[PDB]
Structures are given as structure tokens and as C-alpha cells.
């Protein structure tokens, strides 16, 4: 009844922006609506082996078209 006209609005707008800003993209690494298949080469950028993936995810992501 006091700050509940303050907290909620200022906070709820944050979540509104991280989508709008798209900050959630590179934070959670989700693909972007245009970003799946770099070039054409339609295939699954499937990460494979261990002690790699940090470097292997780079490759798939590296191209990005």
C-alpha cells in the first residue's frame, strides 16, 4: 500500500526490456530468430565431444552468417 506502487512497476519494466533489449539472447545463448543456419548449409549445429564444446560451440556460433 506504500512502496507497492513503486517496486512492481520499476521491476516489471526490467523484464520487459531484457526481451526488448534482447539482453537475454547473449546471456542465455539462445539463438536469435534469424540465427540458426549460417550461409545455407541446412544441418544441425550439434555439439559433439567433451573438453571441446566450449571451443566447439564457438565454431557453429562463429559463422552466424
Amino acid at each position: 500500500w506504500v512502496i507497492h506502487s513503486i517496486t512492481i512497476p520499476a521491476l516489471f519494466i526490467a523484464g520487459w526490456l531484457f526481451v526488448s533489449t534482447g539482453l537475454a539472447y547473449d546471456v542465455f545463448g539462445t539463438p536469435r530468430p534469424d540465427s540458426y543456419y549460417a550461409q545455407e548449409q541446412r544441418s544441425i549445429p550439434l555439439v559433439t565431444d567433451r573438453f571441446e564444446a566450449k571451443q566447439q560451440v564457438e565454431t557453429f556460433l562463429e559463422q552466424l552468417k
Binding site: 516489471f12 526490467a14 523484464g15 520487459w16 526490456l17 526488448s20 530468430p33
Partner: peptide
Amino acid sequence: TVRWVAVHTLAVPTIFFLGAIAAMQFIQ
């Protein structure tokens, strides 16, 4: 005190995700 710590630490993020829900539906 005790009770306050429950909802505050729970329902607050809920309000923060509702941003993601709504603000998404207008993408694309």
C-alpha cells in the same frame, strides 16, 4: 520477519518473468 522472507524471495522473480512472457509475445 519469517513470512515476509518467503513471498519476497519467491513472488518477486515471478513479477520479473512476467516481463519476459509479455514482452516476448510482441516479438517476431
